[PDB]
Curated annotation (Swiss-Prot):
InterPro entries noted in UniProt: FKBP-type_PPIase, PPIase_dom_sf, PPIase_FKBP_dom
Protein name as annotated: Peptidyl-prolyl cis-trans isomerase FKBP1A
Residues modified to N6-acetyllysine: 53
Catalytic activity: [protein]-peptidylproline (omega=180) = [protein]-peptidylproline (omega=0)
Subcellular location: Cytoplasm, Cytosol; Sarcoplasmic reticulum membrane
Complexes and interactors: Interacts with TGFBR1; prevents TGFBR1 phosphorylation by TGFBR2 and stabilizes it in the inactive conformation. Interacts with ACVR1B and SMAD7. Identified in a complex composed of RYR1, PDE4D, PKA, FKBP1A and protein phosphatase 1 (PP1). Interacts directly with RYR2 and RYR3. Interacts with GLMN; rapamycin and FK506 abolish the interaction with GLMN in a dose dependent manner. Interacts directly with RYR1.
E.C. designation(s): 5.2.1.8
Molecular function (Gene Ontology), one example: macrolide binding
Pfam families, per the entry: FKBP_C
Gene name for this UniProt entry: FKBP1A
PROSITE patterns: FKBP_PPIASE
Length: 108
């Protein structure tokens, strides 16, 4: 499948990221079984990426673009939008569906 976006808390409902803007997010990344493999919250530093530059997985590029500033959402991402058949050795297994808890803090 693609990316599914399920709201956890609403944002402003008006400000959506455009290509080339820097998204500032806090995120927690989990496997489908619930195992956490990455989290900006445990590092206490938000993660920044520029939308449209393929600095993140495809599911993030398409999922975060559907979020408004201040929204917290659950993104469910199929492997084709993720680390695919290869996965990531020792971190993400092959053909893994990933779940991300993502809060869009601001755009730069």
């Amino acid at each position: 499948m693609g990316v599914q976006v399920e709201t956890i808390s609403p944002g402003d409902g008006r400000t959506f990221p455009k290509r080339g803007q820097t998204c500032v997010v806090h995120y927690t990344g989990m496997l489908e079984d619930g195992k956490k493999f990455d989290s900006s919250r445990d590092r206490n530093k938000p993660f920044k990426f520029m939308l449209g530059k393929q600095e993140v997985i495809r599911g993030w590029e398409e999922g975060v673009a559907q979020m408004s500033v201040g929204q917290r959402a659950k993104l469910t991402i199929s492997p084709d939008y993720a680390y695919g058949a290869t996965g990531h050795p020792g971190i993400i297994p092959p053909h893994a569906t990933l779940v991300f808890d993502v809060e869009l803090l601001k755009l730069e």
